[PDB]
Design a protein around this nucleic acid. Sequence first.
DNA 1: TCAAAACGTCAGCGGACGTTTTGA
DNA 2: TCAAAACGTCCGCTGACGTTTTGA
Lengths: 152, 153
Amino acid sequence: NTKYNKEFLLYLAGFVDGDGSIIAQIKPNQSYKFKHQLSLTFQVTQKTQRRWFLDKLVDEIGVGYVRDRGSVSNYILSEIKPLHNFLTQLQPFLKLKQKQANLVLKIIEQLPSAKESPDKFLEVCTWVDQIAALNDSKTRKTTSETVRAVLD
Amino acid sequence: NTKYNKEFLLYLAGFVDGDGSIIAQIKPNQSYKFKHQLSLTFQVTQKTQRRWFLDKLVDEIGVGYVRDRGSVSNYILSEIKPLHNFLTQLQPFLKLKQKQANLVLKIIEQLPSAKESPDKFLEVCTWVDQIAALNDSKTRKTTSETVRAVLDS
DNA sequence: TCAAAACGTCAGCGGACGTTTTGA
DNA sequence: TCAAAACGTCCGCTGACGTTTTGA
């Protein structure tokens, strides 16, 4: 469990508050028991000419990777353990995306028990709704209600 | 001048590296001796629903103001001295916009002597060109080559 | 003749989702 | 039946300019 230098945390907090993205999804996927996968992502974008900055982030944070998608590249961090350890340390300093961060931590700690009872699973999908409503959701398609159906 | 704590500067440097614009312009204006204004602007944008953050920031930074344009709002800092003080203290912690910031700090310092001679003025206008080159510039019209042509008459 | 505010514009995004596959 | 990766893509901006006016 890498503990981050506090100075680096303050900087990163500011950076995450400005151009950070905290994403929670419910993904339709027939291979899962409840027919969807709970997915969490932290993400930052940078024009591809400046992806050298994302690559140094991979080093600094020590986890995640870099996606190129044409004109822009993404730093991506999905791994739930590293992500939990990351947001745990960053959360206290966040001013704008602290709510999303809290919801993600809460969702992560409840993953074990969510995968046992369809009730706990659904309460967890409503936490995903709150994250989506705190962001600027434009194209969201699958919701807790999508899962409330289906589970019937 | 305002002294800023290191904690505030660290957070802000990350914020500015991620989401802040350092904008230098040469504005065609006939009332100025050289027919142009040198304009420096530090700018942040938020959706208006989240104005409170820029409003809060005016308080924290102690200077600048917020403009609502409709769906989005800007924090704006264009006053030269306040802006010098702010960037001077912020420059050491910048990792992405650091070069823009240095350039801006240089321009400000040479402004008093740029008003006195068209040569130093044209020079200061090239440092402005370098800021637009570091930004994602797309709709720029007035460069130093414009000012060169205007001062020739 | 300046510093500063006031306000107009718009196209390449990019924040925020989506679907499918890999590899246990 | 999972975690993560890999990749597709929309739409409301918004970064970075522009012009013009205000007040000393």
